[PDB]
Amino acid sequence: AGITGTWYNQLGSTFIVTAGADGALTGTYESAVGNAESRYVLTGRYDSAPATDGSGTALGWTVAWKNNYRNAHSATTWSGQYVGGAEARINTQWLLTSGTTEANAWKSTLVGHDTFTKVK
Amino acid sequence: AGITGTWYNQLGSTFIVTAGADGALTGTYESAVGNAESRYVLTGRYDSAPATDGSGTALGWTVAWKNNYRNAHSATTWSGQYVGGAEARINTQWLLTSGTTEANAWKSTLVGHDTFTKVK
Amino acid sequence: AGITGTWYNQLGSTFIVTAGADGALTGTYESAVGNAESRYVLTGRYDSAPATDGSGTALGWTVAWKNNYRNAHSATTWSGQYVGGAEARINTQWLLTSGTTEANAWKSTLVGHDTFTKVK
Amino acid sequence: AGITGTWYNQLGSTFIVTAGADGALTGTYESAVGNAESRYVLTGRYDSAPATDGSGTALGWTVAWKNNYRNAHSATTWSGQYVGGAEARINTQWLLTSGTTEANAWKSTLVGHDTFTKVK
Numbered sequence: 001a002g003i004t005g006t007w008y009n010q011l012g013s014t015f016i017v018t019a020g021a022d023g024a025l026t027g028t029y030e031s032a033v034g035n036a037e038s039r040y041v042l043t044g045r046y047d048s049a050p051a052t053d054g055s056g057t058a059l060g061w062t063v064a065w066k067n068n069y070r071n072a073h074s075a076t077t078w079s080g081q082y083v084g085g086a087e088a089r090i091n092t093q094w095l096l097t098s099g100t101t102e103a104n105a106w107k108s109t110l111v112g113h114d115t116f117t118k119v120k
Numbered sequence: 121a122g123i124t125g126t127w128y129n130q131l132g133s134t135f136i137v138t139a140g141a142d143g144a145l146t147g148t149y150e151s152a153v154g155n156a157e158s159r160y161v162l163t164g165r166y167d168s169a170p171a172t173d174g175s176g177t178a179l180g181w182t183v184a185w186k187n188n189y190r191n192a193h194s195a196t197t198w199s200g201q202y203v204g205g206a207e208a209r210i211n212t213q214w215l216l217t218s219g220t221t222e223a224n225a226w227k228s229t230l231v232g233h234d235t236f237t238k239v240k
Numbered sequence: 241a242g243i244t245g246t247w248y249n250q251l252g253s254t255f256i257v258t259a260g261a262d263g264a265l266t267g268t269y270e271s272a273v274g275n276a277e278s279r280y281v282l283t284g285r286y287d288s289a290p291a292t293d294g295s296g297t298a299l300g301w302t303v304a305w306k307n308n309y310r311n312a313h314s315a316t317t318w319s320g321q322y323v324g325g326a327e328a329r330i331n332t333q334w335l336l337t338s339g340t341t342e343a344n345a346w347k348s349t350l351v352g353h354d355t356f357t358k359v360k
Numbered sequence: 361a362g363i364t365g366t367w368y369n370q371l372g373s374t375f376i377v378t379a380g381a382d383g384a385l386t387g388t389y390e391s392a393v394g395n396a397e398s399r400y401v402l403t404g405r406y407d408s409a410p411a412t413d414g415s416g417t418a419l420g421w422t423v424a425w426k427n428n429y430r431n432a433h434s435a436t437t438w439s440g441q442y443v444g445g446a447e448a449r450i451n452t453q454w455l456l457t458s459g460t461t462e463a464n465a466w467k468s469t470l471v472g473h474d475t476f477t478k479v480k
């Protein structure tokens with residue numbers, strides 16, 4: 001109900017997710033940036049029984065950057081929390097790992113942050 | 121074939137994963153450490169068509185720290201790569217996000233690294 | 241000139257820095273949050289000869305969370321870049337490491353992000 | 361005494377540091393890898409009064425990747441802890457930020473880990 005929907009980050013990327021009663025996140029990610037084109041499968045987990053003390057719902061998900069059209073040979077993971085209310089928000093940090101040789105493996109992982117809203 | 125199996129990190133945690141032809145990672149994670157007990161659902165993605173130039177296979181997965189017995193109100197995501205061969209290895213970095221209030225949200229996310237092997 | 245001044249993050253923390261011609265950052269950090277009180281020494285480095293193609297100036301600094309009044313047994317490092325202009329900005333990611341036992345060393349390092357402005 | 365000396369990471373990079381009574385880290389970093397050549401200035405902070413319960417000494421430092429010969433337009437920060445004894449160790453996580461345009465700023469920051477020893 002809270003986590004299920006279409007979400008928009010600060011850089012124009014669309015996250016369409018369903019939050020299953022089991023704790024399963026399933027969906028699609030459409031990336032407005034990077035070496036990516038069009039629509040990619042999303043899987044993840046959330047806290048299906050969160051704390052009743054104004055605390056956020058912990059969640060996470062993975063996109064492997066491969067569809068029928070593109071393969072970037074990379075995967076992003078987002079770790080974050082859902083803050084429910086009027087201005088509903090998913091505050092995340094992410095790791096983008098690229099498939100490298102063992103000589104290039106030191107420089108394989110980019111780190112960043114995304115804030116997602118239900119407002120396009 | 122390569123990614124499918126039972127994997128062991130440096131701190132004694134067991135990762136039992138199946139790598140589907142679609143790019144789906146499904147499994148269980150058993151955590152030897154932290155505010156955790158017993159067995160937790162794992163979902164993730166991998167690069168199902170990796171590069172043929174000695175480069176690793178990009179992957180990632182999520183565990184929400186909630187089963188039938190425990191709820192830590194937290195989720196870990198691992199971002200990494202599979203290096204195939206005799207000494208087969210998953211080199212990862214991870215983000216552990218805890219469900220917090222907006223006052224505690226600065227301190228919500230632990231970062232670290234895990235190396236997983238097929239040797240117990 | 242650009243980097244030298246008083247800077248304010250999103251959570252009300254004050255960063256007073258001098259950018260030396262050698263590439264040295266020296267200053268004080270006053271933390272509005274965490275297990276901290278009052279004023280702490282800052283040292284760091286910046287790119288003293290940045291690129292002339294609209295690119296930001298790479299920098300970084302360290303605060304050990306120990307003064308004459310408090311010791312949190314911890315250190316934060318910020319890694320980022322200075323974007324110069326009318327709305328002058330330091331966009332950073334940070335690592336906060338706490339002094340732990342080898343049993344607690346997995347959970348020693350918090351990760352986050354700060355944006356600093358010259359507007360209080 | 362403990363932190364003062366010559367340190368060697370897993371990838372052959374040399375860290376020569378002095379730990380001042382004030383909490384100041386001063387030195388040189390010689391990087392065996394990346395778009396770097398030869399010797400670079402290091403500044404940082406450590407916990408000058410650590411806990412007496414077998415806990416590590418929190419520290420951190422910055423290298424801006426600019427000397428008289430090279431400028432990579434980038435800075436690394438290491439956040440970590442000193443574990444003293446027979447097999448003396450600095451366990452770190454690091455952030456490498458590159459000077460980018462605001463279009464490339466999502467991909468500006470690499471994350472990783474280094475373990476440093478006093479054995480070449």
Ligand SMILES: O=C(O)CCCC[C@@H]1SC[C@@H]2NC(=O)N[C@@H]21
Nearest residue numbers: 013031034035036065072074076
């Ligand atoms: O460039 C690549 O290697 C593949 C595309 C990566 C897209 C990145 S992942 C972090 C950030 N979140 C997004 O909305 N997309 C970018």
Ligand SMILES: O=C(O)CCCC[C@@H]1SC[C@@H]2NC(=O)N[C@@H]21
Nearest residue numbers: 133151154155156185192194196
């Ligand atoms: O303590 C918690 O909040 C829940 C358990 C967390 C387990 C952590 S996640 C990173 C690391 N990988 C493991 O094998 N388990 C620990």
Ligand SMILES: O=C(O)CCCC[C@@H]1SC[C@@H]2NC(=O)N[C@@H]21
Nearest residue numbers: 253271274275276305312314316
């Ligand atoms: O709580 C502690 O262990 C010591 C204080 C930490 C202050 C943190 S560091 C990251 C962030 N930046 C700030 O302005 N202060 C907080």
Ligand SMILES: O=C(O)CCCC[C@@H]1SC[C@@H]2NC(=O)N[C@@H]21
Nearest residue numbers: 373391394395396425432434436
């Ligand atoms: O390639 C660059 O942009 C400059 C050189 C970076 C060297 C990296 S920083 C992290 C790691 N630690 C080292 O010993 N050097 C590499």
